[PDB]
mmCIF file of C-alpha atoms in Angstrom:
data_model
loop_
_atom_site.group_PDB
_atom_site.id
_atom_site.type_symbol
_atom_site.label_atom_id
_atom_site.label_comp_id
_atom_site.label_asym_id
_atom_site.label_seq_id
_atom_site.Cartn_x
_atom_site.Cartn_y
_atom_site.Cartn_z
ATOM 1 C CA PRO X 1 -77.870 -32.420 34.950
ATOM 2 C CA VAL X 2 -76.274 -31.367 38.222
ATOM 3 C CA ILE X 3 -73.779 -29.612 35.686
ATOM 4 C CA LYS X 4 -69.943 -29.805 35.849
ATOM 5 C CA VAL X 5 -69.088 -26.151 36.541
ATOM 6 C CA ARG X 6 -68.122 -25.690 40.229
ATOM 7 C CA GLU X 7 -69.817 -23.299 42.650
ATOM 8 C CA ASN X 8 -67.402 -20.823 44.223
ATOM 9 C CA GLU X 9 -65.852 -22.356 47.336
ATOM 10 C CA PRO X 10 -66.533 -26.111 47.164
ATOM 11 C CA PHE X 11 -69.467 -27.605 49.134
ATOM 12 C CA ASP X 12 -71.486 -30.909 49.297
ATOM 13 C CA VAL X 13 -74.529 -29.259 47.741
ATOM 14 C CA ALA X 14 -74.195 -28.598 44.033
ATOM 15 C CA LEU X 15 -75.753 -25.161 43.109
ATOM 16 C CA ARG X 16 -77.688 -26.742 40.232
ATOM 17 C CA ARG X 17 -79.673 -23.603 39.202
ATOM 18 C CA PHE X 18 -76.876 -21.089 38.450
ATOM 19 C CA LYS X 19 -75.099 -23.675 36.165
ATOM 20 C CA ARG X 20 -77.826 -25.071 33.945
ATOM 21 C CA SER X 21 -78.834 -23.146 30.780
ATOM 22 C CA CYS X 22 -80.656 -25.488 28.241
ATOM 23 C CA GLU X 23 -80.008 -29.168 29.538
ATOM 24 C CA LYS X 24 -82.721 -31.968 29.808
ATOM 25 C CA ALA X 25 -85.513 -30.122 27.885
ATOM 26 C CA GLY X 26 -86.648 -32.419 24.966
ATOM 27 C CA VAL X 27 -83.705 -34.920 25.189
ATOM 28 C CA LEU X 28 -84.017 -36.561 28.709
ATOM 29 C CA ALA X 29 -87.433 -35.012 29.545
ATOM 30 C CA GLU X 30 -89.771 -37.442 27.496
ATOM 31 C CA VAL X 31 -88.566 -40.420 29.604
ATOM 32 C CA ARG X 32 -90.102 -43.908 29.090
ATOM 33 C CA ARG X 33 -92.048 -42.691 26.090
ATOM 34 C CA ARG X 34 -92.113 -43.143 22.397
ATOM 35 C CA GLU X 35 -89.862 -40.618 20.603
ATOM 36 C CA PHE X 36 -91.452 -38.752 17.763
ATOM 37 C CA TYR X 37 -89.806 -36.905 14.825
ATOM 38 C CA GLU X 38 -92.132 -33.734 14.090
ATOM 39 C CA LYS X 39 -94.442 -33.940 17.113
ATOM 40 C CA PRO X 40 -92.361 -31.503 19.396
ATOM 41 C CA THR X 41 -93.110 -28.544 16.937
ATOM 42 C CA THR X 42 -96.826 -28.579 18.348
ATOM 43 C CA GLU X 43 -96.559 -30.693 21.560
ATOM 44 C CA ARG X 44 -93.841 -28.722 23.504
ATOM 45 C CA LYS X 45 -93.493 -25.211 22.036
ATOM 46 C CA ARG X 46 -96.155 -23.703 24.398
ATOM 47 C CA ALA X 47 -94.104 -20.667 25.677
ATOM 48 C CA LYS X 48 -96.395 -17.887 24.220
ATOM 49 C CA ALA X 49 -99.524 -19.779 25.566
ATOM 50 C CA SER X 50 -98.123 -20.030 29.051
ATOM 51 C CA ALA X 51 -97.106 -16.367 29.063
ATOM 52 C CA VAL X 52 -100.783 -15.008 28.613
ATOM 53 C CA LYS X 53 -102.200 -16.444 31.893
ATOM 54 C CA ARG X 54 -99.276 -14.735 33.747
ATOM 55 C CA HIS X 55 -100.082 -11.356 32.007
ATOM 56 C CA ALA X 56 -103.712 -11.837 32.960
ATOM 57 C CA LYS X 57 -102.900 -12.599 36.622
ATOM 58 C CA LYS X 58 -100.652 -9.496 36.919
ATOM 59 C CA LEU X 59 -103.554 -7.390 35.263
ATOM 60 C CA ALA X 60 -106.269 -8.590 37.713
ATOM 61 C CA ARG X 61 -104.231 -7.528 40.899
ATOM 62 C CA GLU X 62 -104.737 -3.847 39.794
ATOM 63 C CA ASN X 63 -108.416 -4.643 38.702
ATOM 64 C CA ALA X 64 -109.407 -5.981 42.243
ATOM 65 C CA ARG X 65 -108.232 -2.476 43.358
ATOM 66 C CA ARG X 66 -110.199 -0.602 40.625
ATOM 67 C CA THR X 67 -113.473 -2.511 41.608
ATOM 68 C CA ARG X 68 -112.527 -1.850 45.298
ATOM 69 C CA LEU X 69 -112.872 -5.454 46.787
ATOM 70 C CA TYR X 70 -109.433 -5.028 48.444
ATOM 71 C CA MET I 1 -66.745 -17.062 -9.494
ATOM 72 C CA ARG I 2 -68.655 -18.014 -6.308
ATOM 73 C CA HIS I 3 -66.786 -17.853 -2.916
ATOM 74 C CA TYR I 4 -66.486 -20.779 -0.454
ATOM 75 C CA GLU I 5 -64.842 -20.195 2.989
ATOM 76 C CA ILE I 6 -63.320 -23.741 3.822
ATOM 77 C CA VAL I 7 -61.966 -24.156 7.343
ATOM 78 C CA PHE I 8 -60.265 -27.425 8.322
ATOM 79 C CA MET I 9 -58.111 -28.642 11.244
ATOM 80 C CA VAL I 10 -55.208 -30.965 11.337
ATOM 81 C CA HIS I 11 -53.630 -33.420 13.832
ATOM 82 C CA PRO I 12 -50.332 -31.899 15.262
ATOM 83 C CA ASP I 13 -48.052 -34.961 14.575
ATOM 84 C CA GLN I 14 -49.607 -35.309 10.972
ATOM 85 C CA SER I 15 -48.988 -31.675 9.956
ATOM 86 C CA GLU I 16 -45.758 -32.763 8.161
ATOM 87 C CA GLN I 17 -48.090 -34.405 5.451
ATOM 88 C CA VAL I 18 -49.895 -31.175 4.385
ATOM 89 C CA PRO I 19 -47.115 -29.036 2.633
ATOM 90 C CA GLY I 20 -47.150 -31.505 -0.347
ATOM 91 C CA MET I 21 -50.942 -31.810 -0.434
ATOM 92 C CA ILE I 22 -51.823 -28.097 -0.118
ATOM 93 C CA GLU I 23 -49.912 -27.007 -3.275
ATOM 94 C CA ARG I 24 -51.748 -29.598 -5.480
ATOM 95 C CA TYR I 25 -55.096 -28.348 -4.067
ATOM 96 C CA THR I 26 -54.229 -24.664 -4.923
ATOM 97 C CA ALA I 27 -53.210 -25.776 -8.493
ATOM 98 C CA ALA I 28 -56.539 -27.534 -8.937
ATOM 99 C CA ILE I 29 -58.377 -24.261 -7.984
ATOM 100 C CA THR I 30 -56.354 -21.832 -10.152
ATOM 101 C CA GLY I 31 -56.479 -24.503 -12.803
ATOM 102 C CA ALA I 32 -60.221 -23.667 -12.882
ATOM 103 C CA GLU I 33 -59.611 -19.845 -12.852
ATOM 104 C CA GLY I 34 -60.667 -19.447 -9.248
ATOM 105 C CA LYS I 35 -58.531 -17.656 -6.697
ATOM 106 C CA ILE I 36 -56.793 -17.802 -3.267
ATOM 107 C CA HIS I 37 -57.901 -14.581 -1.751
ATOM 108 C CA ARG I 38 -56.126 -14.996 1.680
ATOM 109 C CA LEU I 39 -54.921 -18.414 2.874
ATOM 110 C CA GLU I 40 -54.592 -17.854 6.670
ATOM 111 C CA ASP I 41 -53.019 -20.410 8.923
ATOM 112 C CA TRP I 42 -54.044 -19.678 12.645
ATOM 113 C CA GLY I 43 -51.662 -22.004 14.618
ATOM 114 C CA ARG I 44 -52.635 -24.610 17.248
ATOM 115 C CA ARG I 45 -55.770 -24.458 19.316
ATOM 116 C CA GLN I 46 -57.475 -26.660 21.944
ATOM 117 C CA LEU I 47 -60.481 -28.724 20.661
ATOM 118 C CA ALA I 48 -63.428 -28.988 23.063
ATOM 119 C CA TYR I 49 -63.870 -32.711 22.225
ATOM 120 C CA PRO I 50 -61.187 -34.826 20.395
ATOM 121 C CA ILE I 51 -61.835 -35.800 16.846
ATOM 122 C CA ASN I 52 -59.673 -38.809 15.747
ATOM 123 C CA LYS I 53 -57.929 -38.306 19.228
ATOM 124 C CA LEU I 54 -55.874 -35.457 20.934
ATOM 125 C CA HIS I 55 -57.441 -32.398 22.422
ATOM 126 C CA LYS I 56 -55.433 -30.147 20.045
ATOM 127 C CA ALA I 57 -55.509 -29.137 16.352
ATOM 128 C CA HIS I 58 -54.094 -26.703 14.045
ATOM 129 C CA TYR I 59 -56.589 -24.609 12.133
ATOM 130 C CA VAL I 60 -56.178 -23.528 8.505
ATOM 131 C CA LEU I 61 -58.486 -21.088 6.548
ATOM 132 C CA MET I 62 -57.945 -21.446 2.796
ATOM 133 C CA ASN I 63 -60.359 -18.718 1.596
ATOM 134 C CA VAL I 64 -61.176 -20.203 -1.970
ATOM 135 C CA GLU I 65 -63.104 -19.046 -4.893
ATOM 136 C CA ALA I 66 -63.460 -22.060 -7.207
ATOM 137 C CA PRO I 67 -66.409 -22.999 -9.616
ATOM 138 C CA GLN I 68 -69.367 -25.033 -8.275
ATOM 139 C CA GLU I 69 -68.409 -28.327 -10.078
ATOM 140 C CA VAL I 70 -64.857 -28.177 -8.481
ATOM 141 C CA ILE I 71 -65.731 -27.311 -4.803
ATOM 142 C CA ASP I 72 -67.980 -30.436 -4.550
ATOM 143 C CA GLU I 73 -64.863 -32.473 -5.344
ATOM 144 C CA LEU I 74 -62.503 -30.452 -3.123
ATOM 145 C CA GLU I 75 -64.930 -30.611 -0.152
ATOM 146 C CA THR I 76 -65.100 -34.358 -0.403
ATOM 147 C CA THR I 77 -61.357 -34.241 -0.560
ATOM 148 C CA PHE I 78 -60.715 -32.169 2.505
ATOM 149 C CA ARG I 79 -63.122 -34.140 4.682
ATOM 150 C CA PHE I 80 -61.586 -37.571 3.663
ATOM 151 C CA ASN I 81 -58.017 -36.263 4.175
ATOM 152 C CA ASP I 82 -56.564 -38.310 6.980
ATOM 153 C CA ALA I 83 -54.072 -35.506 8.011
ATOM 154 C CA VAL I 84 -57.345 -33.453 8.339
ATOM 155 C CA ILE I 85 -59.431 -34.612 11.327
ATOM 156 C CA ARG I 86 -62.717 -32.750 10.286
ATOM 157 C CA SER I 87 -63.691 -29.889 7.897
ATOM 158 C CA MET I 88 -66.548 -27.381 7.234
ATOM 159 C CA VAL I 89 -67.189 -25.114 4.137
ATOM 160 C CA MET I 90 -69.707 -22.167 4.285
ATOM 161 C CA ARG I 91 -72.082 -20.409 1.764
ATOM 162 C CA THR I 92 -71.630 -17.734 -0.797
ATOM 163 C CA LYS I 93 -74.295 -15.527 1.054
ATOM 164 C CA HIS I 94 -72.969 -12.900 3.452
ATOM 165 C CA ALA I 95 -69.292 -13.902 2.854
ATOM 166 C CA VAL I 96 -66.100 -11.812 3.402
ATOM 167 C CA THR I 97 -62.887 -12.512 1.440
ATOM 168 C CA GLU I 98 -61.218 -9.323 2.924
ATOM 169 C CA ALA I 99 -60.970 -7.883 6.432
ATOM 170 C CA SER I 100 -60.829 -11.154 8.464
ATOM 171 C CA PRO I 101 -63.186 -11.759 11.439
ATOM 172 C CA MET I 102 -60.354 -14.019 12.903
ATOM 173 C CA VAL I 103 -57.382 -11.568 12.160
ATOM 174 C CA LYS I 104 -56.878 -10.797 15.972
ATOM 175 C CA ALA I 105 -57.690 -14.500 17.067
ATOM 176 C CA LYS I 106 -54.988 -15.689 14.610
ATOM 177 C CA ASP I 107 -52.268 -13.343 15.834
ATOM 178 C CA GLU I 108 -53.280 -14.176 19.477
ATOM 179 C CA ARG I 109 -52.731 -17.845 18.650
ATOM 180 C CA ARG I 110 -49.162 -17.330 17.270
ATOM 181 C CA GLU I 111 -48.246 -14.897 20.176
ATOM 182 C CA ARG I 112 -49.813 -16.636 23.146
ATOM 183 C CA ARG I 113 -52.067 -19.807 22.597
ATOM 184 C CA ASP I 114 -49.852 -22.410 21.052
ATOM 185 C CA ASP I 115 -47.868 -24.950 23.195
ATOM 186 C CA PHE I 116 -44.386 -23.392 22.137
ATOM 187 C CA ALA I 117 -43.203 -26.988 21.829
ATOM 188 C CA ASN I 118 -41.868 -29.536 19.435
ATOM 189 C CA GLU I 119 -45.339 -31.045 18.718
ATOM 190 C CA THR I 120 -46.468 -27.430 17.579
ATOM 191 C CA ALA I 121 -43.141 -26.753 15.712
ATOM 192 C CA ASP I 122 -44.432 -29.565 13.476
ATOM 193 C CA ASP I 123 -47.522 -27.260 12.740
ATOM 194 C CA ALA I 124 -45.599 -24.070 11.841
ATOM 195 C CA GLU I 125 -43.954 -25.569 8.686
ATOM 196 C CA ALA I 126 -47.568 -26.231 7.448
ATOM 197 C CA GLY I 127 -48.701 -22.940 9.221
ATOM 198 C CA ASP I 128 -47.959 -19.341 8.125
ATOM 199 C CA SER I 129 -44.311 -20.563 7.405
ATOM 200 C CA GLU I 130 -45.852 -22.245 4.367
ATOM 201 C CA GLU I 131 -43.906 -23.822 1.442
ATOM 202 C CA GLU I 132 -45.589 -24.704 -1.911
ATOM 203 C CA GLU I 133 -44.528 -25.388 -5.586
ATOM 204 C CA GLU I 134 -44.949 -22.321 -8.015
ATOM 205 C CA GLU I 135 -47.709 -22.346 -10.634
ATOM 206 C CA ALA H 1 -77.551 16.153 14.225
ATOM 207 C CA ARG H 2 -78.544 13.865 11.238
ATOM 208 C CA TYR H 3 -77.160 10.568 9.859
ATOM 209 C CA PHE H 4 -75.123 9.446 13.052
ATOM 210 C CA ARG H 5 -76.592 5.985 12.180
ATOM 211 C CA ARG H 6 -75.886 3.152 14.602
ATOM 212 C CA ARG H 7 -73.319 4.456 17.058
ATOM 213 C CA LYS H 8 -74.249 2.299 20.094
ATOM 214 C CA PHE H 9 -77.289 0.948 22.050
ATOM 215 C CA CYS H 10 -79.611 2.284 19.320
ATOM 216 C CA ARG H 11 -81.810 0.362 16.957
ATOM 217 C CA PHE H 12 -82.282 -2.423 19.547
ATOM 218 C CA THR H 13 -81.128 -2.222 23.228
ATOM 219 C CA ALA H 14 -79.077 -5.452 22.691
ATOM 220 C CA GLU H 15 -76.546 -5.544 19.886
ATOM 221 C CA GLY H 16 -76.884 -8.286 17.281
ATOM 222 C CA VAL H 17 -73.579 -10.149 17.219
ATOM 223 C CA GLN H 18 -72.965 -12.279 14.094
ATOM 224 C CA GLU H 19 -75.667 -13.982 11.911
ATOM 225 C CA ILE H 20 -74.119 -17.094 10.459
ATOM 226 C CA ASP H 21 -70.376 -16.642 10.980
ATOM 227 C CA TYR H 22 -68.394 -19.289 12.970
ATOM 228 C CA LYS H 23 -64.680 -18.738 11.970
ATOM 229 C CA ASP H 24 -64.303 -16.223 14.763
ATOM 230 C CA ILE H 25 -64.587 -18.229 18.007
ATOM 231 C CA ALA H 26 -65.628 -15.023 19.932
ATOM 232 C CA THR H 27 -68.879 -14.235 18.039
ATOM 233 C CA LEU H 28 -70.393 -17.580 18.951
ATOM 234 C CA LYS H 29 -69.338 -17.235 22.647
ATOM 235 C CA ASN H 30 -71.575 -14.057 22.889
ATOM 236 C CA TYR H 31 -74.604 -16.244 23.684
ATOM 237 C CA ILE H 32 -72.748 -19.185 25.385
ATOM 238 C CA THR H 33 -72.817 -19.920 29.121
ATOM 239 C CA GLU H 34 -69.911 -21.060 31.317
ATOM 240 C CA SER H 35 -71.598 -24.617 31.074
ATOM 241 C CA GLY H 36 -70.441 -24.143 27.365
ATOM 242 C CA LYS H 37 -73.929 -23.976 25.823
ATOM 243 C CA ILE H 38 -76.559 -21.627 24.174
ATOM 244 C CA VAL H 39 -78.974 -19.606 26.432
ATOM 245 C CA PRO H 40 -82.666 -19.878 25.297
ATOM 246 C CA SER H 41 -84.062 -17.098 23.004
ATOM 247 C CA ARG H 42 -87.009 -16.134 25.311
ATOM 248 C CA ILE H 43 -84.663 -14.944 28.152
ATOM 249 C CA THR H 44 -82.216 -12.801 26.217
ATOM 250 C CA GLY H 45 -84.889 -11.008 23.902
ATOM 251 C CA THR H 46 -82.672 -11.626 20.810
ATOM 252 C CA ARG H 47 -84.467 -10.997 17.300
ATOM 253 C CA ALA H 48 -85.415 -14.347 15.573
ATOM 254 C CA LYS H 49 -83.199 -14.043 12.399
ATOM 255 C CA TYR H 50 -79.823 -13.668 14.224
ATOM 256 C CA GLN H 51 -80.890 -16.682 16.281
ATOM 257 C CA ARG H 52 -82.239 -18.882 13.485
ATOM 258 C CA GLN H 53 -78.949 -18.534 11.524
ATOM 259 C CA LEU H 54 -76.882 -19.014 14.836
ATOM 260 C CA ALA H 55 -78.794 -22.387 15.303
ATOM 261 C CA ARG H 56 -77.027 -23.651 12.157
ATOM 262 C CA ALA H 57 -73.672 -21.868 13.027
ATOM 263 C CA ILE H 58 -73.467 -23.137 16.564
ATOM 264 C CA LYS H 59 -74.125 -26.823 15.500
ATOM 265 C CA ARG H 60 -71.601 -26.430 12.702
ATOM 266 C CA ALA H 61 -69.055 -24.921 15.245
ATOM 267 C CA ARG H 62 -69.755 -27.705 17.851
ATOM 268 C CA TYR H 63 -69.085 -30.369 15.055
ATOM 269 C CA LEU H 64 -65.702 -28.810 14.329
ATOM 270 C CA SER H 65 -64.810 -28.946 18.070
ATOM 271 C CA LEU H 66 -64.880 -25.297 18.388
ATOM 272 C CA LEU H 67 -67.571 -26.015 21.142
ATOM 273 C CA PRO H 68 -68.703 -28.947 23.444
ATOM 274 C CA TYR H 69 -71.771 -30.654 22.130
ATOM 275 C CA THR H 70 -72.571 -32.606 25.353
ATOM 276 C CA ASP H 71 -72.137 -32.231 29.186
ATOM 277 C CA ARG H 72 -69.338 -34.968 29.005
ATOM 278 C CA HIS H 73 -67.281 -32.574 26.919
ATOM 279 C CA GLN H 74 -67.048 -30.014 29.770
ATOM 280 C CA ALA P 1 -63.903 -61.862 75.193
ATOM 281 C CA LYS P 2 -60.439 -61.277 73.669
ATOM 282 C CA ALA P 3 -58.173 -63.982 72.163
ATOM 283 C CA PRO P 4 -54.290 -63.990 71.541
ATOM 284 C CA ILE P 5 -54.393 -63.230 67.792
ATOM 285 C CA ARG P 6 -51.393 -62.270 65.553
ATOM 286 C CA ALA P 7 -50.917 -58.654 64.300
ATOM 287 C CA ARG P 8 -52.637 -57.651 60.873
ATOM 288 C CA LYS P 9 -50.392 -56.247 58.162
ATOM 289 C CA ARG P 10 -52.242 -56.866 54.791
ATOM 290 C CA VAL P 11 -52.076 -54.942 51.512
ATOM 291 C CA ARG P 12 -54.487 -54.986 48.579
ATOM 292 C CA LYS P 13 -53.427 -51.939 46.472
ATOM 293 C CA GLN P 14 -53.252 -49.016 48.988
ATOM 294 C CA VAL P 15 -54.555 -46.414 46.373
ATOM 295 C CA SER P 16 -55.092 -43.529 48.943
ATOM 296 C CA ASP P 17 -57.356 -41.680 46.481
ATOM 297 C CA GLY P 18 -60.220 -42.486 44.022
ATOM 298 C CA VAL P 19 -63.131 -41.634 41.765
ATOM 299 C CA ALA P 20 -66.714 -42.623 42.379
ATOM 300 C CA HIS P 21 -69.490 -43.110 39.724
ATOM 301 C CA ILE P 22 -73.159 -42.669 40.231
ATOM 302 C CA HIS P 23 -75.569 -44.156 37.528
ATOM 303 C CA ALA P 24 -79.155 -42.779 38.515
ATOM 304 C CA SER P 25 -82.098 -44.387 36.537
ATOM 305 C CA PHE P 26 -85.856 -44.250 37.020
ATOM 306 C CA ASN P 27 -86.307 -47.531 39.076
ATOM 307 C CA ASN P 28 -82.996 -47.774 41.055
ATOM 308 C CA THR P 29 -79.553 -46.128 41.746
ATOM 309 C CA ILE P 30 -76.263 -47.991 41.187
ATOM 310 C CA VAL P 31 -73.322 -46.564 43.317
ATOM 311 C CA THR P 32 -69.650 -47.654 42.498
ATOM 312 C CA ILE P 33 -66.153 -46.771 43.967
ATOM 313 C CA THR P 34 -63.056 -47.070 41.636
ATOM 314 C CA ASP P 35 -59.266 -46.043 41.609
ATOM 315 C CA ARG P 36 -58.568 -42.851 39.706
ATOM 316 C CA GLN P 37 -56.667 -44.804 36.919
ATOM 317 C CA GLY P 38 -59.907 -46.887 36.670
ATOM 318 C CA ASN P 39 -60.531 -50.161 38.512
ATOM 319 C CA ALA P 40 -63.556 -51.093 40.731
ATOM 320 C CA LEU P 41 -62.844 -51.276 44.517
ATOM 321 C CA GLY P 42 -66.548 -52.097 45.318
ATOM 322 C CA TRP P 43 -70.136 -51.216 44.697
ATOM 323 C CA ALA P 44 -73.583 -51.247 46.499
ATOM 324 C CA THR P 45 -77.252 -50.638 45.515
ATOM 325 C CA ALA P 46 -80.668 -49.319 46.698
ATOM 326 C CA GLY P 47 -82.549 -52.372 45.298
ATOM 327 C CA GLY P 48 -80.223 -54.561 47.478
ATOM 328 C CA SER P 49 -81.347 -52.515 50.491
ATOM 329 C CA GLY P 50 -84.822 -54.092 49.642
ATOM 330 C CA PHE P 51 -87.175 -50.947 49.600
ATOM 331 C CA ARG P 52 -88.892 -52.198 46.341
ATOM 332 C CA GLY P 53 -91.849 -50.462 44.614
ATOM 333 C CA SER P 54 -91.574 -46.616 44.132
ATOM 334 C CA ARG P 55 -89.726 -46.385 47.479
ATOM 335 C CA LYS P 56 -86.724 -48.116 45.651
ATOM 336 C CA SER P 57 -86.095 -44.833 43.594
ATOM 337 C CA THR P 58 -85.730 -42.237 46.330
ATOM 338 C CA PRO P 59 -82.895 -39.921 47.711
ATOM 339 C CA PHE P 60 -82.875 -41.865 51.052
ATOM 340 C CA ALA P 61 -82.587 -45.419 49.614
ATOM 341 C CA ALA P 62 -79.904 -44.024 47.274
ATOM 342 C CA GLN P 63 -78.012 -42.391 50.252
ATOM 343 C CA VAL P 64 -77.853 -45.692 52.223
ATOM 344 C CA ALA P 65 -76.592 -47.448 48.984
ATOM 345 C CA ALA P 66 -73.637 -44.872 48.877
ATOM 346 C CA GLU P 67 -72.783 -45.512 52.707
ATOM 347 C CA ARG P 68 -72.766 -49.322 52.042
ATOM 348 C CA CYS P 69 -70.129 -49.115 49.208
ATOM 349 C CA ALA P 70 -68.016 -46.331 50.905
ATOM 350 C CA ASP P 71 -67.722 -48.566 54.155
ATOM 351 C CA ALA P 72 -66.398 -51.648 52.236
ATOM 352 C CA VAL P 73 -63.392 -49.868 50.351
ATOM 353 C CA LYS P 74 -61.382 -49.003 53.649
ATOM 354 C CA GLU P 75 -59.917 -52.397 53.257
ATOM 355 C CA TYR P 76 -58.551 -51.388 49.797
ATOM 356 C CA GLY P 77 -56.890 -48.537 51.795
ATOM 357 C CA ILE P 78 -58.578 -45.672 49.979
ATOM 358 C CA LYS P 79 -58.404 -42.412 52.122
ATOM 359 C CA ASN P 80 -59.793 -39.556 49.733
ATOM 360 C CA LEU P 81 -62.631 -39.435 47.077
ATOM 361 C CA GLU P 82 -63.913 -37.419 44.043
ATOM 362 C CA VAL P 83 -67.320 -38.132 42.384
ATOM 363 C CA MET P 84 -68.750 -38.380 38.849
ATOM 364 C CA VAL P 85 -72.633 -38.000 38.493
ATOM 365 C CA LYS P 86 -74.487 -39.528 35.613
ATOM 366 C CA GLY P 87 -78.289 -39.372 35.468
ATOM 367 C CA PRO P 88 -81.525 -37.274 36.213
ATOM 368 C CA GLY P 89 -82.782 -39.849 38.889
ATOM 369 C CA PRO P 90 -83.324 -39.264 42.646
ATOM 370 C CA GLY P 91 -80.291 -39.018 44.984
ATOM 371 C CA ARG P 92 -79.067 -35.801 43.216
ATOM 372 C CA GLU P 93 -77.459 -34.585 46.467
ATOM 373 C CA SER P 94 -78.415 -37.438 48.918
ATOM 374 C CA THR P 95 -75.971 -39.879 47.300
ATOM 375 C CA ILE P 96 -73.178 -37.266 47.625
ATOM 376 C CA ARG P 97 -74.054 -36.668 51.307
ATOM 377 C CA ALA P 98 -73.576 -40.390 52.090
ATOM 378 C CA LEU P 99 -69.917 -40.466 50.607
ATOM 379 C CA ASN P 100 -69.261 -37.170 52.550
ATOM 380 C CA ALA P 101 -70.580 -38.951 55.759
ATOM 381 C CA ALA P 102 -67.994 -41.752 54.897
ATOM 382 C CA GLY P 103 -65.393 -39.078 55.835
ATOM 383 C CA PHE P 104 -64.428 -37.843 52.433
ATOM 384 C CA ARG P 105 -64.000 -34.351 50.895
ATOM 385 C CA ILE P 106 -66.227 -34.413 47.843
ATOM 386 C CA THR P 107 -65.115 -31.016 46.321
ATOM 387 C CA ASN P 108 -65.526 -32.208 42.742
ATOM 388 C CA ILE P 109 -69.123 -33.156 41.913
ATOM 389 C CA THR P 110 -68.433 -33.417 38.075
ATOM 390 C CA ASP P 111 -71.600 -33.975 36.207
ATOM 391 C CA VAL P 112 -70.494 -36.056 33.142
ATOM 392 C CA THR P 113 -74.060 -37.133 32.469
ATOM 393 C CA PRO P 114 -74.016 -38.166 28.738
ATOM 394 C CA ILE P 115 -76.413 -36.215 26.554
ATOM 395 C CA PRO P 116 -76.517 -38.269 23.392
ATOM 396 C CA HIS P 117 -77.081 -36.231 20.212
ATOM 397 C CA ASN P 118 -80.766 -37.578 20.592
ATOM 398 C CA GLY P 119 -80.128 -41.378 21.070
ATOM 399 C CA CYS P 120 -82.093 -44.619 20.742
ATOM 400 C CA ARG P 121 -86.014 -44.507 21.246
ATOM 401 C CA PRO P 122 -87.144 -45.280 24.811
ATOM 402 C CA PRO P 123 -89.911 -47.863 25.525
ATOM 403 C CA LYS P 124 -93.530 -46.815 24.888
ATOM 404 C CA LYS P 125 -94.694 -48.249 28.263
ATOM 405 C CA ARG P 126 -98.552 -48.356 28.491
ATOM 406 C CA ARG P 127 -100.564 -49.076 25.450
ATOM 407 C CA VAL P 128 -102.757 -45.963 25.698
#
């Protein structure tokens, strides 16, 4: 998943980030493991859950200021 | 009756087969009191991946109404046509039979996106330059 | 003044383009990268219906070789 | 010291230009030079460099596998290369760098890595 689309002016290092959009996730990610049929619906779909801790972290920066520790 | 938007694509060199087949399929529809509400041929287009070989196909939008009993037989028919490489038919829900979403993409094809070659001349007699027996 | 109703850039900041149509090639390509593939739904802030119906339409379209299915088809 | 040897003149297929294929797995890398019309002009490996263990699946053992095959094909009379990449394994860039150190322009790094439409079930590995 270095991705076929060529970075402007050719160089030895592939610009892997700007190319990739939805590759590996689910298909070539659960490597050397038993593939399940309905398991992904609860195992993998953790985007909302992982978003909360990041909202909390960005809240507390302002709250260290309001308590005055900084 | 209920409306089914069948789109199919055809192998360039095999296009010569379709002008005899298409007029029996239209007689089978109207023979069931359904209707041909457009029948748009789009010309030749590049496939992303080949299907039964060649990177090119010629795309034809029939725009049927036919009863529910008949479309299950016609859909099986259009998929197992050899001249046809693959086919898809969409639902009655949120369907247009007027005002085509591909009207511009069609015209663009004839003007600009064919080969303009002998292998796409073969398409144009099965294309908008269509010939069929009268019902 | 009243009843202007959906000029531009109003109801939603991002326009919904198609639902379930695939016969226009251009409507699908509205959410398709230069890699030739769908962008995830979290990043764009698309509304779930237009996306849920596009999940069928995009797979349908790919199977008719209106799209590459696979990186080998780029 | 030097001997009075005849002149060398030999031909093999003189292809001047090629494609390379890189198959990256989880335990090894396999690195292979071919003609552009599709015929093997040599190969090397990272397992045949004898690193073994985890060290066998690293960008550096993969690089030196690429420099081993790329040396051998001068005798085939190849002079330019292009490369095909196929896998998620290590040597993403390091394999490329070793063909580029073989003196080739490597402008086309075409990922062709096959994404099956969800293929065949991989091995369970450990029983927990």
